[PDB]
Amino acid sequence: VKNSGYCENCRVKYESLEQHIVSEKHLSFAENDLNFEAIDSLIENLR
Amino acid sequence: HVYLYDLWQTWAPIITLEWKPQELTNLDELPYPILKIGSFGRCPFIGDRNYDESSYKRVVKRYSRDKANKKYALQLRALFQYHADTLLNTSKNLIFIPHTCNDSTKSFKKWMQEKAKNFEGNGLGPTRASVMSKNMKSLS
Amino acid sequence: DIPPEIKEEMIQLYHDLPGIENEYKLIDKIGEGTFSSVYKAKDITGKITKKFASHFWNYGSNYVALKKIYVTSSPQRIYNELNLLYIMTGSSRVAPLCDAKRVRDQVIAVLPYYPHEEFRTFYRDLPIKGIKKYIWELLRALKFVHSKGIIHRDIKPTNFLFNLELGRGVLVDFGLAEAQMDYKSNHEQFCPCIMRNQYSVNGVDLTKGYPKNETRRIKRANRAGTRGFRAPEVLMKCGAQSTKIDIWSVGVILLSLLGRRFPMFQSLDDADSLLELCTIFGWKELRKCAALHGLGFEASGLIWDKPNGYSNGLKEFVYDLLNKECTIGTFPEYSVAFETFGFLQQELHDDAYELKKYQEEIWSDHYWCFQVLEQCFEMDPQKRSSAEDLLKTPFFNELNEN
Amino acid sequence: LRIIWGTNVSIQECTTNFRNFLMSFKYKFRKILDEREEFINNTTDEELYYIKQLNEMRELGTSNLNLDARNLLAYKQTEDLYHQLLNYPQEVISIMDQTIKDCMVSLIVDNNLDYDLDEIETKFYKVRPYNVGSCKGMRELNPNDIDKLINLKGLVLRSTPVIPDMKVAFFKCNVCDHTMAVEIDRGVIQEPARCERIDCNEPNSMSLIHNRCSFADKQVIKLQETPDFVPDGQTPHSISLCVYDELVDSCRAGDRIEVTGTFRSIPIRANSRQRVLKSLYKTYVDVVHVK
Ligand SMILES: Nc1ncnc2c1ncn2[C@@H]1O[C@H](COP(=O)(O)OP(=O)(O)OP(O)(O)=S)[C@@H](O)[C@H]1O
Ligand SMILES: [Mg+2]
Ligand SMILES: [Zn+2]
Ligand SMILES: [Zn+2]
Ligand SMILES: [Zn+2]
């Protein structure tokens, strides 16, 4: 559980990576495709 | 002290370091980087701390590490000797510039001069405000 | 052969990306980082290997590097890195973007694998001509990046990947690469440092001391980069930053090779790194540098070993970094540093004639190397030389074979 | 490390926990807490609650955030912060004010908003916890409840006029007319015993200029307790509340108000001539929120 640091996505500091990624706010951010929009241009711009 | 500020006084001072005289004692560790040189690739400011490169116990390490590390450096030397561009490498074999400063090999030969059978976290951070309240400073 | 704890990481990358089971077979993990863990992978189906063949180094069989950007990175920062990797392709010294894939919060950047040696292994053994080839390739990459007009803030030995036997390299990281915007939407306006639009007495001084409870906001300027390679202009908070700072990051590496010390600056704090620059140069030089960005420097009562130290030049510096080394005995018998040491014993006074004219070769090389080293190590942003002029300097007189 | 002496409060840990609570709280957390999960509507109970509140306060220019204390019970990381705030309101509320300032600065900078940062930095932001645990009336509080965040409910009967509380004392030299401005420290102002000017060092030259000092608003409000639980045989009680610097004149006589504030005790001097305090302390409330 040594992994600890900031998260620019959730704007919250976590003491554990395996519990931040399964937290409520992080899952809500990941499931929302509107946040990952400009990258969506690149996935198929190259392909 | 060290004090870096804005002459326009428009921004808050960037550097405000104020050390008491007793903190200036114990020259082994200053609160600021006094230039040190060091050896064996050390960061100049970092010294040889708890490290005596003159200790034979250390010496049998660095020369021997140099023995296994010898021919990797020989290959690199022969590959980067004559031309900076490496596309004209293939062509007496090795040339060297003479020196007189003592060495790891010379040190180890000296230690056999002197000891052997003879005498002598994540990477990001939250965006914090710059102005600290008086109560928060008092709580410190 | 693979250690067991990396198997969980790769099976995580397989699980986290449902569609990556094919088209990519991960062989190893080439390198980890603060913002990403890069993974050595083979290409199951050949799009980006059959394409992009000019970019790949044909050193052995060709593989592909997929940069698994860490989850905590913001979408705008990931987009920034990927977009700037996108706009600069068709260049052999940039590691351009062959592919990209996003699933939920995980983004993979697939770029050509470039076989490279870490700096900390070959820095000490590099001959002066090898240092020259290193700096030439670095300056070519910086020249392309600066012509594109962005600041690759993090220029460091790790972020420039260089194969010795092929003898060329590529600039890989760009996560922290800021894009310069125009000077206007000869030291009157580029650097009174006016930016943030905040440029528009009796009883108090504000030069002999600082307010006890300060009611002023600190400047907010970009500090992205790496400890020990931050330029003076980024060490004292300065807006209107330019590509010039990356040139400084070229010198430090050039200073790392000459002296055989990789961690050139500890740089624990911005103040700590700035005082580290005071020891090699001098308090007055740093204060006159600060007076340019509109800021005032002040330090007293400090026991500096040499006031205005290393004034003869950085020459004397590397000579001391070599002195302690050549007295204790820290260099091997097959060392390359002894040539530089004997050349500084020239510059400071304190058959077989390939001996003599290779003597002249390496001495002329060292003499011009210190000239480029001091052009890189300049306090003034504007009067510092750019990448083009730095590449036109007569130290690099091996570009005729082009 | 480095917790505060006499408290469980650590500045770093409390700041981190409160910042995480502010950035990642939704009202569905409290709806789950109150066993009301079937009232949960995805439209307004799934937005970050305090992020929206911070944005509204930034747009409106206000400075006070009304924090529902029970919300801290909904969040897992602030389950201890609730008890720390109740037990040590002073330190925790100061840390919360600082954290609000950091949070708003982060909201402006990280999202790259157009809003000027000069007037945000110089603004003092305040937190008003109100919905703390409602029990124990007022007469059931023991001396162990001094300096704790309590919640009273009652009727406003009376309010004294605005009392000036000196924050900065302005002294002036009777000889050279040189003035220093002393700051109050825990209710004590250090009167200078010598002119700090190096030119004249007259001992008693300095005199306090009452009308040129800096004053703040203080008001005492007489409240009648209307507790939820009334022990047998007791009669209605009256207490004195203290409102400071923005809450003055916010309560008029006849108002039924629920007031959250710090349960304080002060020693009362027996006589106006000598400095002798009474061993029996007098209890009152420093108001931090009025509902
Ligand atoms: N194309 C590549 N081929 C081989 N190694 C690579 C390649 N691109 C990146 N790396 C390695 O990636 C490691 C670090 O990842 P980077 O691409 O530098 O990004 P990063 O994780 O942001 O790194 P920092 O934190 O800025 S050093 C280094 O050890 C590089 O050698
Ligand atoms: Mg990087
Ligand atoms: Zn997150
Ligand atoms: Zn500047
Ligand atoms: Zn006087």
PDB file of C-alpha atoms in Angstrom, chain B residues 27-94:
ATOM      1  CA  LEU B  27      29.864  21.768   8.724  1.00  0.00           C
ATOM      2  CA  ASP B  28      29.226  18.081   7.880  1.00  0.00           C
ATOM      3  CA  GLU B  29      25.588  19.085   7.107  1.00  0.00           C
ATOM      4  CA  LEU B  30      24.682  22.690   6.223  1.00  0.00           C
ATOM      5  CA  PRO B  31      21.072  23.781   5.620  1.00  0.00           C
ATOM      6  CA  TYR B  32      22.288  25.084   2.235  1.00  0.00           C
ATOM      7  CA  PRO B  33      24.576  23.440  -0.416  1.00  0.00           C
ATOM      8  CA  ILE B  34      28.180  24.573   0.261  1.00  0.00           C
ATOM      9  CA  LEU B  35      30.135  23.326  -2.782  1.00  0.00           C
ATOM     10  CA  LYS B  36      31.850  19.977  -2.090  1.00  0.00           C
ATOM     11  CA  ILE B  37      33.663  18.075  -4.848  1.00  0.00           C
ATOM     12  CA  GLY B  38      33.457  14.317  -4.157  1.00  0.00           C
ATOM     13  CA  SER B  39      34.766  11.441  -6.317  1.00  0.00           C
ATOM     14  CA  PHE B  40      33.633   8.355  -8.361  1.00  0.00           C
ATOM     15  CA  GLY B  41      30.809  10.254 -10.082  1.00  0.00           C
ATOM     16  CA  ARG B  42      29.361  11.650  -6.867  1.00  0.00           C
ATOM     17  CA  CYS B  43      26.984  14.615  -7.076  1.00  0.00           C
ATOM     18  CA  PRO B  44      29.515  17.407  -6.300  1.00  0.00           C
ATOM     19  CA  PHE B  45      27.301  18.841  -3.495  1.00  0.00           C
ATOM     20  CA  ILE B  46      26.953  15.296  -2.004  1.00  0.00           C
ATOM     21  CA  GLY B  47      30.182  14.277  -0.172  1.00  0.00           C
ATOM     22  CA  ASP B  48      31.684  10.796   0.382  1.00  0.00           C
ATOM     23  CA  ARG B  49      29.482  10.340   3.479  1.00  0.00           C
ATOM     24  CA  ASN B  50      30.337   7.219   5.490  1.00  0.00           C
ATOM     25  CA  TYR B  51      32.479   6.378   2.454  1.00  0.00           C
ATOM     26  CA  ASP B  52      36.272   6.236   2.588  1.00  0.00           C
ATOM     27  CA  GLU B  53      37.494   5.487  -0.937  1.00  0.00           C
ATOM     28  CA  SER B  54      40.978   5.130   0.563  1.00  0.00           C
ATOM     29  CA  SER B  55      39.785   2.141   2.600  1.00  0.00           C
ATOM     30  CA  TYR B  56      41.186  -1.027   1.008  1.00  0.00           C
ATOM     31  CA  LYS B  57      37.891  -2.756   1.857  1.00  0.00           C
ATOM     32  CA  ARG B  58      36.426  -0.246  -0.610  1.00  0.00           C
ATOM     33  CA  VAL B  59      39.428  -0.445  -2.944  1.00  0.00           C
ATOM     34  CA  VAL B  60      39.149  -4.188  -3.618  1.00  0.00           C
ATOM     35  CA  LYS B  61      35.649  -3.303  -4.782  1.00  0.00           C
ATOM     36  CA  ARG B  62      36.262  -0.363  -7.241  1.00  0.00           C
ATOM     37  CA  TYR B  63      39.364  -1.837  -8.926  1.00  0.00           C
ATOM     38  CA  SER B  64      37.685  -5.263  -9.228  1.00  0.00           C
ATOM     39  CA  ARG B  65      34.462  -3.630 -10.517  1.00  0.00           C
ATOM     40  CA  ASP B  66      36.779  -1.956 -12.990  1.00  0.00           C
ATOM     41  CA  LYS B  67      38.210  -5.298 -13.900  1.00  0.00           C
ATOM     42  CA  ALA B  68      34.837  -6.715 -14.967  1.00  0.00           C
ATOM     43  CA  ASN B  69      33.897  -3.305 -16.424  1.00  0.00           C
ATOM     44  CA  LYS B  70      37.181  -3.126 -18.333  1.00  0.00           C
ATOM     45  CA  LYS B  71      36.413  -4.424 -21.833  1.00  0.00           C
ATOM     46  CA  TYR B  72      32.940  -2.863 -22.110  1.00  0.00           C
ATOM     47  CA  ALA B  73      34.827   0.433 -21.847  1.00  0.00           C
ATOM     48  CA  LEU B  74      37.500  -0.964 -24.201  1.00  0.00           C
ATOM     49  CA  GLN B  75      34.832  -1.735 -26.829  1.00  0.00           C
ATOM     50  CA  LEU B  76      33.318   1.726 -26.351  1.00  0.00           C
ATOM     51  CA  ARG B  77      36.778   3.341 -26.551  1.00  0.00           C
ATOM     52  CA  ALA B  78      37.673   1.497 -29.764  1.00  0.00           C
ATOM     53  CA  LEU B  79      34.265   2.380 -31.215  1.00  0.00           C
ATOM     54  CA  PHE B  80      34.468   6.130 -30.394  1.00  0.00           C
ATOM     55  CA  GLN B  81      38.222   6.785 -30.761  1.00  0.00           C
ATOM     56  CA  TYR B  82      39.010   8.287 -34.191  1.00  0.00           C
ATOM     57  CA  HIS B  83      35.744   9.663 -35.631  1.00  0.00           C
ATOM     58  CA  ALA B  84      32.803  11.270 -33.848  1.00  0.00           C
ATOM     59  CA  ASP B  85      30.526   9.763 -36.487  1.00  0.00           C
ATOM     60  CA  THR B  86      30.447   5.999 -35.960  1.00  0.00           C
ATOM     61  CA  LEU B  87      29.746   5.075 -39.602  1.00  0.00           C
ATOM     62  CA  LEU B  88      33.499   5.017 -40.389  1.00  0.00           C
ATOM     63  CA  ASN B  89      34.656   2.792 -37.527  1.00  0.00           C
ATOM     64  CA  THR B  90      36.242  -0.117 -39.408  1.00  0.00           C
ATOM     65  CA  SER B  91      39.839   0.533 -40.459  1.00  0.00           C
ATOM     66  CA  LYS B  92      47.385   1.022 -33.983  1.00  0.00           C
ATOM     67  CA  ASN B  93      44.411  -0.716 -32.389  1.00  0.00           C
ATOM     68  CA  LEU B  94      44.302   1.364 -29.196  1.00  0.00           C
TER      69      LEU B  94
END
